[PDB]
UniProtKB/Swiss-Prot annotation:
The gene is nikA. Belongs to the bacterial solute-binding protein 5 family. PROSITE patterns: SBP_BACTERIAL_5 (PS01040). GO terms for cellular component: ATP-binding cassette (ABC) transporter complex, substrate-binding subunit-containing; membrane; outer membrane-bounded periplasmic space; periplasmic space. Its main location: periplasm. It is found in: Periplasm. The lineage of its organism: Bacteria, Pseudomonadati, Pseudomonadota, Gammaproteobacteria, Enterobacterales. It comes from the Bacteria. Keywords: Nickel, Periplasm, Signal, Transport. InterPro entries: CntA-like, Peptide/Ni-bd, SBP_5, SBP_5_CS, SBP_5_dom. This is Nickel-binding periplasmic protein.
Length: 499
């Protein structure tokens, strides 16, 4: 059976409501549900469920011409009415989509005919098409599967137009997908995909070694990185490591002592030998990051000055700010108060703990006492939401979220980035400029605004960028080369071709 594969995920795929978040898993929502326009690696979108579109003067009114040959997996038609109903269902839950500015921008969605769909916006929102292309929430479930003409209170069957259909799910055991034999587009070569629920990274590696799974595909947490490196030399196996997809960093709390001091945040940014951190904890598998966004990120090639590892400079910065060493102690003090910073992380995540131990050791060497606070996932999520941290691990979102959607979300108070930035004197100016950059028509102004926002965030040392991380693959050689999807959160199962 070379047209059936078995893979793994730490949890079940969830209900596969196209319009909700946890516990829905994005890769799976993307397997079943499809967008009007599809994101491509080059930053553009191509026609998808919409074959063409135009906008008014006045980029506020958009009219999409939809395909007329698409059916949902249950045989019901996809048309402008079905699409319009989906937009209504999403926007009936508007507050849950605040992070995504398109959700605050849509004023009206109307089916003008079976094939003409009209969307009107508040303002001329530039990233409109890219946001329609996201895994969620703007993808389409058969409206017959709404509950009481909504999706925010749940759905019936997870019926999409996509190339995969969920066959069955068993909580804490597995999820099975089958090829859609009535897909409007190209038939996948793979007919069946089974996801075994395997929460532990070493258990996932063991399941591969035993032959129990055929494919593992994910970020730096996919499997232990020492094991991945051994696998890459094993001629019985296939492995891949993509080019970097996003940044991993610390976020520093500018509203909490002692990270409220610019000098402290600058010093911390000179204290870490990132190459050593990566060679120590990540087995050399990732790239050093010195800016929030890699220079390859749209609008982010700004020539920002890196803070290279320089513990002499880190110490001098702290000294100048009045943090000095008592005899004969290693931890600096100012006004008799110790230079102590809490780093909270998920206590069961071994990679986080490994990185945190390295960070603690590096910062001790410059006289900062980092306290490691390892907690359960729920408590960490609460800390980020509410600003109850000194430092936390954080990551960017990858294409096409970076930079515009990541920046957009910095304005949302109940999230880590706003919370980390809350202490900055220029936070209001930053949030103003983020609003402006999303709305601006003037392309030179757009570049200037991105420059200013990213330059302030960099110069104010809000983050401590660590690494640009890659997607990783481990596979049975019989599966062949495994492609990557343009959207960092999607897995392109329909492009796998064992041939
Ligand atoms: O992540 C948040 O801060 C809030 N999420 C909005 C932005 N995410 C997009 C999304 O969830 O679709 C960004 C994102 C990008 C890439 C991978 C994962 C990911 O979540 C919504 C969100 C809400 C509840 C639980 C988990 C969630 O992700
Ligand atoms: Cl989740
Ligand atoms: Cl490797
Ligand atoms: Cl001072
Ligand atoms: Fe999210």
């Amino acid at each position: 059976a070379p047209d059936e594969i078995t893979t793994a995920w730490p949890v079940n795929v969830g209900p596969l409501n196209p319009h909700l978040y946890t516990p829905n898993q994005m890769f799976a929502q993307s397997m079943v549900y499809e967008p009007l326009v599809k994101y491509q690696a080059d930053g553009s979108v191509i026609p998808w469920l919409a074959k063409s579109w135009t906008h008014s003067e006045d980029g506020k009114t958009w009219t999409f011409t939809l395909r007329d040959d698409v059916k949902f997996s249950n045989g019901e038609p996809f048309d402008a009415e079905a699409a319009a109903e989906n937009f209504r269902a999403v926007l009936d839950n508007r507050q849950r989509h605040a992070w995504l500015e398109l959700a605050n921008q849509i004023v009206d969605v109307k089916a003008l005919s079976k094939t003409e769909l009209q969307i009107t916006l508040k303002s001329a929102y530039y990233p409109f098409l890219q946001e329609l292309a996201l895994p969620r929430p703007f993808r389409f479930i058969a409206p017959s599967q709404f509950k009481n003409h909504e999706t925010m209170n749940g759905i019936k069957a997870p019926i999409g137009t996509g190339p995969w259909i969920l066959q069955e799910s068993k909580l804490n055991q597995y999820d099975v997908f089958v090829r859609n034999e009535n897909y409007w587009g190209e038939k996948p070569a793979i007919k069946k995909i089974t996801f075994n629920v395997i929460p532990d990274p070493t258990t996932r590696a063991v399941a591969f070694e035993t032959g129990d799974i055929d494919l593992l595909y994910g970020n730096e947490g996919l499997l232990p990185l020492d094991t991945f490196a051994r696998f890459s030399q094993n001629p019985a196996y296939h492995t891949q490591l993509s080019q970097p997809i996003e940044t991993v960093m610390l976020a520093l709390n500018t509203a909490k002592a002692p990270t409220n001091e610019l000098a402290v945040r600058e010093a911390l940014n000179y204290a870490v030998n990132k190459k050593s951190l990566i060679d120590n904890a990540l087995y050399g598998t990732q790239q050093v990051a010195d800016t929030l966004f890699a220079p390859s990120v749209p609008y982010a090639n700004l020539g920002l000055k890196p803070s290279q590892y320089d513990p002499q400079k880190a110490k001098a910065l702290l000294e100048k700010a009045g943090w000095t060493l008592p005899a004969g102690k290693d931890i600096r003090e100012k006004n008799g108060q110790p230079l102590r910073i809490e780093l909270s992380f998920i206590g069961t995540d071994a990679l986080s703990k490994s990185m945190a131990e390295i960070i603690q050791a590096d910062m001790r060497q410059i006289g900062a006492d980092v306290s490691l606070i390892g907690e359960e996932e729920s408590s960490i999520y609460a800390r980020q939401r509410d600003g109850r941290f000194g430092m936390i691990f954080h990551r960017t979102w990858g294409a096409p979220y970076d930079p515009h959607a990541f920046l957009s979300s910095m304005r949302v108070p109940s999230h880590a980035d706003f919370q980390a930035q809350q202490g900055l004197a220029d936070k209001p100016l930053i949030d103003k400029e983020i609003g402006e950059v999303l709305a601006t028509h003037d392309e030179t102004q757009r570049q200037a605004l991105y420059r200013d926002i990213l330059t302030r965030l960099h110069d104010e040392a809000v983050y401590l960028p660590i690494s640009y991380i890659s997607m990783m693959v481990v596979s049975k050689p019989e599966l062949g080369n495994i492609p990557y999807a343009p959207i960092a959160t999607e897995i392109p199962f329909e492009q796998i071709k064992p041939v």
